[PDB]
Amino acid sequence: GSEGAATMFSPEQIAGKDVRLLRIKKEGSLDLALEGGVDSPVGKVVVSAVYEGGAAERHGGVVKGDEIMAINGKIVTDYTLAEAEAALQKAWNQGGDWIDLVVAVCPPKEYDDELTFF
C-alpha cells in the first residue's frame, strides 16, 4: 500500500531510505534465489533471481538486484545466505496465505568495480 515496515531498523540504518512492503501470495511455492550476505562481496541480501516458475515472478514489481532486509518481519540485514534463504523458506514452508517481503527499492543498473584485487 502506501506505508509499510519502517521502524524495526535503526535511524542511522534507513536514513530516510525508500523501502516498501511487498506482499506475495503463498501459492505455487516460493522459488526464489538469494545472493550476498555473510562475508560476501555484497554485504547484504539481494534477490539473485526471480524464478519465472514461482510465486515470486507471479507477483512481479521488484526483480533481481533488490535490497532484501526483512523477510515476513525478520531482520536479515546481518543474516547469511543460508540463514535468510532458509528463513524465507521456513515462512513459505509454513504454508501461509501470503508473505510480506521487506526489501528496499533499487533499479537494475549494475555497476560496482573499484579494487585491483591484490
Curated annotation (Swiss-Prot):
Disruption phenotype: Mice lacking Ush1c display abnormal brush border morphology along the length of the intestinal tract. Residues 18-105 form the PDZ domain. It is found in: Cytoplasm, Cytosol; Cytoplasm, Cytoskeleton; Cell projection, Microvillus. Detected in stereocilia of cochlear hair cells (at protein level). Isoform 1 is expressed in the eye, cochlea, vestibule, heart, kidney, small intestine and testis; it is barely visible in skeletal muscle, liver, and lung and is absent from the brain. Isoforms 2 and 3 are expressed in the cochlea and vestibule. It comes from the Eukaryota. Part of the IMAC/intermicrovillar adhesion complex/intermicrovillar tip-link complex composed of ANKS4B, MYO7B, USH1C, CDHR2 and CDHR5. Part of a complex composed of USH1C, USH1G and MYO7A. Interacts with F-actin. Interacts with USH2A. Interacts with SLC4A7. Interacts (via PDZ1 domain) with the C-terminus of USHBP1. Interacts (via N-terminus and PDZ 2 domain) with CDH23. Interacts with USH1G. Interacts with MYO7B. Interacts with CDHR2 and CDHR5; may mediate their interaction with MYO7B at the microvilli tip. Interacts (via PDZ 1 domain) with ANKS4B. Interacts (via PDZ 1 domain) with DOCK4. Anchoring/scaffolding protein that is a part of the functional network formed by USH1C, USH1G, CDH23 and MYO7A that mediates mechanotransduction in cochlear hair cells. Required for normal development and maintenance of cochlear hair cell bundles. As part of the intermicrovillar adhesion complex/IMAC plays a role in brush border differentiation, controlling microvilli organization and length. Probably plays a central regulatory role in the assembly of the complex, recruiting CDHR2, CDHR5 and MYO7B to the microvilli tips. The PDZ 1 domain mediates interaction with ANKS4B, USHBP1, USH1G, SLC4A7. This is Harmonin. It comes from Mus musculus. The lineage of its organism: Eukaryota, Metazoa, Chordata, Craniata, Vertebrata.
